[PDB]
Design a protein around this ligand. Structure first.
Ligand SMILES: CCC[C@@H]1C[C@@H](C(=O)N[C@@H]([C@H]2O[C@H](SC)[C@H](O)[C@@H](O)[C@H]2O)[C@@H](C)O)N(C)C1
Ligand SMILES: [K+]
Ligand SMILES: [Mg+2]
Ligand SMILES: [Mg+2]
Ligand SMILES: [Mg+2]
Ligand SMILES: [Mg+2]
Ligand SMILES: [Mg+2]
Ligand SMILES: [Mg+2]
Ligand SMILES: [Mg+2]
Ligand SMILES: [Mg+2]
Ligand SMILES: [Mg+2]
Ligand SMILES: [Mg+2]
Ligand SMILES: [Mg+2]
Ligand SMILES: [Mg+2]
Ligand SMILES: [Mg+2]
Ligand SMILES: [Mg+2]
Ligand SMILES: [Mg+2]
Ligand SMILES: [Mg+2]
Ligand SMILES: [Mg+2]
Ligand SMILES: [Mg+2]
Ligand SMILES: [Mg+2]
Ligand SMILES: [Mg+2]
Ligand SMILES: [Mg+2]
Ligand SMILES: [Mg+2]
Ligand SMILES: [Mg+2]
Ligand SMILES: [Mg+2]
Ligand SMILES: [Mg+2]
Ligand SMILES: [Mg+2]
Ligand SMILES: [Mg+2]
Ligand SMILES: [Mg+2]
Ligand SMILES: [Mg+2]
Ligand SMILES: [Mg+2]
Ligand SMILES: [Mg+2]
Ligand SMILES: [Mg+2]
Ligand SMILES: [Mg+2]
Ligand SMILES: [Mg+2]
Lengths: 73, 133, 56
RNA sequence: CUGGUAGUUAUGGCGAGAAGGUCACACCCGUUCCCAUACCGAACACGGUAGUUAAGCUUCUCUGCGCCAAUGGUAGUUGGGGGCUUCCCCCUGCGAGAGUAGGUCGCUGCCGGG
RNA sequence: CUGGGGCGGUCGCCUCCUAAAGAGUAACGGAGGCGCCCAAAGGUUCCCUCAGAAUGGAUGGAAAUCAUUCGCAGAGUGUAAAGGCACAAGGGAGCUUGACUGCGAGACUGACAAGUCGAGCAGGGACGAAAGUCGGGCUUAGUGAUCCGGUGGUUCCGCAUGGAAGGGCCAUCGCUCAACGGAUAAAAGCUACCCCGGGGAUAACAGGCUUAUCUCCCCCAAGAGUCCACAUCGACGGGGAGGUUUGGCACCUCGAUGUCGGCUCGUCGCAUCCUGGGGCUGUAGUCGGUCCCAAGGGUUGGGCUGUUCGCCCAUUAAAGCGGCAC
RNA sequence: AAUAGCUCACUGGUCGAGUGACCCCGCGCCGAAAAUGUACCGGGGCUAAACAUAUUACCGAAACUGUGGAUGAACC
RNA sequence: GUCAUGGAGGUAGAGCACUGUUUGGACUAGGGGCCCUUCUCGGGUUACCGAAUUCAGAUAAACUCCGAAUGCCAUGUACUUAUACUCGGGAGUCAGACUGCGAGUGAUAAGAUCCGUAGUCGAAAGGGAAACAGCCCAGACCACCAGUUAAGGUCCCCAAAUA
RNA sequence: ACAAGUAGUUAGAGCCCGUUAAUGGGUGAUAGCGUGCCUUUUGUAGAAUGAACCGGCGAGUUACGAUUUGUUGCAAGGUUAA
């Protein structure tokens, strides 16, 4: 009666803290906001975080419990 | 001893590495039976050990069972090949790790405590030490 | 300045250890190499200490 | 000193106690007007200043709750070795969680009035 | 597909655990969902805060609707689960149709086919005073290629020429093709009458590994035994040995390792059936019980059934149990 | 049969130095029965030729080195 | 490859803040035994049950207030090393095995099965483990009646200690 | 003619020879080491397959296309078919 599972969706970080990215680079794939859109970062319809401009990726604490990812030129 | 209900009917066997994380110092009683090596203790063995203890004390003093058989185990019948999914739940066990105090007694003199506990130890599949608070 | 000598075989050793021995510049068993004593080199030696002997 | 508005993982919070006020800020008074209530001028909005620090606000005190937190030890574990192996032991490096000594009743801006 | 095959179950998609703190990761492993829904349950602007409990109160009950207090969320989020969400992503209300057209730097995922995200640009809008947000829905299922047909459009082609027929292009519809990368538009059985190619890649015999089960031996001792645990039994539980059972696995053998019972011939083990020696006895004697030593020899003939086994008749000192390809 | 017999909880004498519980660690013992033949150190055999801790010599490979030779690549 | 630096990620461990499982005590609303007028409405009764409440104590693959070692992604003006990538021509492979470690299935059986991870075999001769693909040591270009070592050894078979 | 043999190989006396003259030839007491070849396999000395022996015969070819590399001629050209 078991024997089922969905295809794995390859979630998680796609670029490293300190790595240079081009505009549109997906930074994080996620369900909901495990990580929040920081500065120069957008949240897509499926919660995907992407760089809005070229620059360097920085994963940062938001405050105590939450986390954000930013892109600094 | 059986859980009134369980979230999952089937459960990994697990492992028994390391010293018991809790219940290593005798807490409610004067004397305790301490597991020296690890083992699964079945509910049938806990009962056999309890009745042996309690009978010798002659409904005197108190007996705390400090282990509970939370974990189900399954078996396949004889004449059944491998596969076709996990077997039916057969029994209930408490994985006892080394250092875990399994039984505690109070309200009897040392001599009677120490005898009731050796009588219990002979029903358990694990090497035991008697320890006092 | 360190003198590093490969004393044990790489046969049967994991790739990380083999790759480190290669980066140290060691070839066959009893190969010797002379390296400047840095943290970088010290770190390599530590990963493969069981394979090599180190003098000064 | 106080009003506004920011930053900072609550060491900033909660709770308890005290003091303060025409300069603000409040409560407060009123519904004619703009504007309001799925009923209610409660709120929102507008017009006032008789009354009051009671509350909010501000300042001060405290460790009861929370929060922060070493050192040491221990668990675990990379690598290297041994065993009698449900598992356990030794060497090297890393090293928690809990507990604890301790810390905390914030700190740091810019603007307006005084 | 398959711990041989058949029978049963399963087949695509989503969520979780397995999964070893990136990603990925198997099993006829452990759990659940899907093949939709919503004209608002979408967009935007503004405003809001839930579960439960206590106390008080007409119908009114444990529980309806009021009121106060405490309440980080114990609620909710169309729907499984996980991850999120109280500046709400939860709850009201007003206006709306961005559930837009052309696209798209660049990324993710990935054998391919596909799948996913996307700032920004242009057109023309919705809401908002503006800032701005809006290319459906908190996120991740809700689907199916090509070929062929149908319908709508069309500054495309039109077989001498003008047309037309018919085609192309754009849009859209028609399949559990669900065995869900779909052999065809269109498909069930039997073979002991069988045949060929292969396989010890894979079953039936025996060997091997394993020993759950099985046989034997122990530990503890509640008890039974008038009394008395241990003469003899020994519950509840615990530990082994053996490799004769029922099994598990699929390692040798499918260019053949003949498979049950019997006959003939035995040989070996000892966990001993008899005979020999001995301890204990709940051993008066005669008989026994139980344990220890002991494998030298011995260990029946019939009735029934293919039987092994078993029951029976009649004996015997005794009518042993096992291994040797049962 | 009960009474007594013996033997004694309890002693002063001897005779006189140790004696009795309990816990931990090392190494052993029993528990220990299978089928052709010893048959659960490869054998002999071993009381160390076993075990523990420490030490040093030596043996031991087609490893590495020495001598000669052949050969690929890269470089000059 | 290492060093340094930054980061994502919830395993081991641990913990009980949530969810499930769970022991003992205290408390306490009900219900159920027991008589009473009684409608057992409520008393006087209670270890016959029982939901919260706390105090102490356990427990978890599908619990988490926490949380390593490693591994992973990246940066460097660090030190070593020698490959990467692209485009073409030609393949073979799609039965794997055991060992160690981490899991599932199984009985915490299997030389079982199925993944992950490393190694060896496969395709690897040599030495050791009596013999013994997969264990220990170690990689055979050829010749030598030279040498030094590895695992394993040194009384005899049998080279070396009756150290 | 006291020996336990995948038949050799390494060491090696003794005996017998005398060459394409070489640190030669035949034989081999004794000693060490040593499980054919092929196929098929995770793994075969295999108690898996095939071959009694010897000899002969016995399996990637050609044509026409495609593509790629090498070579040669000519080159913004090159080349002819029947
Ligand atoms: C349950 C049986 C298991 C199998 C039996 C065996 C086999 O095939 N036997 C053959 C035999 O046939 C003849 S005997 C009449 C032949 O002479 C004899 O050699 C042999 O081939 C036949 C009886 O089927 N297999 C190897 C395994
Ligand atoms: K025991
Ligand atoms: Mg998967
Ligand atoms: Mg969407
Ligand atoms: Mg090794
Ligand atoms: Mg099978
Ligand atoms: Mg089957
Ligand atoms: Mg992962
Ligand atoms: Mg058409
Ligand atoms: Mg025409
Ligand atoms: Mg398919
Ligand atoms: Mg017939
Ligand atoms: Mg087979
Ligand atoms: Mg069989
Ligand atoms: Mg056989
Ligand atoms: Mg297999
Ligand atoms: Mg044959
Ligand atoms: Mg006997
Ligand atoms: Mg008959
Ligand atoms: Mg037979
Ligand atoms: Mg060499
Ligand atoms: Mg754990
Ligand atoms: Mg956990
Ligand atoms: Mg493995
Ligand atoms: Mg296997
Ligand atoms: Mg092969
Ligand atoms: Mg080899
Ligand atoms: Mg050998
Ligand atoms: Mg071979
Ligand atoms: Mg040598
Ligand atoms: Mg030497
Ligand atoms: Mg010698
Ligand atoms: Mg002779
Ligand atoms: Mg002789
Ligand atoms: Mg033949
Ligand atoms: Mg060609």
């Amino acid at each position: 009666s078991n024997g089922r599972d969905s295809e794995s969706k390859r979630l998680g970080a796609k670029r490293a803290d300190g790595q240079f990215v081009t505009g549109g680079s997906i930074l994080y794939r996620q369900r909901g906001t495990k990580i929040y859109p920081g500065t120069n970062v957008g949240r897509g319809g499926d919660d995907t975080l992407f760089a809005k401009t070229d620059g360097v990726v920085r994963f940062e604490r938001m405050g105590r419990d939450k986390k954000k990812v930013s892109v600094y030129p | 001893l059986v859980p009134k209900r369980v979230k999952y009917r089937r459960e990994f066997r697990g492992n028994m590495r390391g010293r018991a994380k809790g219940g290593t110092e005798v807490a409610f009683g004067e004397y305790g039976l301490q597991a020296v090596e690890a083992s699964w203790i079945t509910n049938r063995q806990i009962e056999a050990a309890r009745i042996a203890m309690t009978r010798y004390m002659k409904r005197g003093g108190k007996v705390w069972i400090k282990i509970f058989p939370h974990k189900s185990y399954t078996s396949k019948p004889i004449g059944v090949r491998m596969g076709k999914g996990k077997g039916a739940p057969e029994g209930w066990v408490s994985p006892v790790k080394r250092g875990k105090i399994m039984f505690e007694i109070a309200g009897v003199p040392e001599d009677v405590a120490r005898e009731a506990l050796r009588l219990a130890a002979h029903k358990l599949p694990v090497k035991t030490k008697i320890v006092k608070r | 300045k360190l003198e590093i000598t490969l004393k044990r075989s790489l046969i049967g050793r994991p790739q990380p250890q083999r790759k480190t021995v290669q980066a140290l510049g060691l070839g066959k068993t009893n190969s010797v190499v002379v390296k400047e004593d840095n943290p970088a080199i010290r770190g390599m030696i530590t990963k493969v200490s069981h394979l090599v002997d180190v003098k000064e």
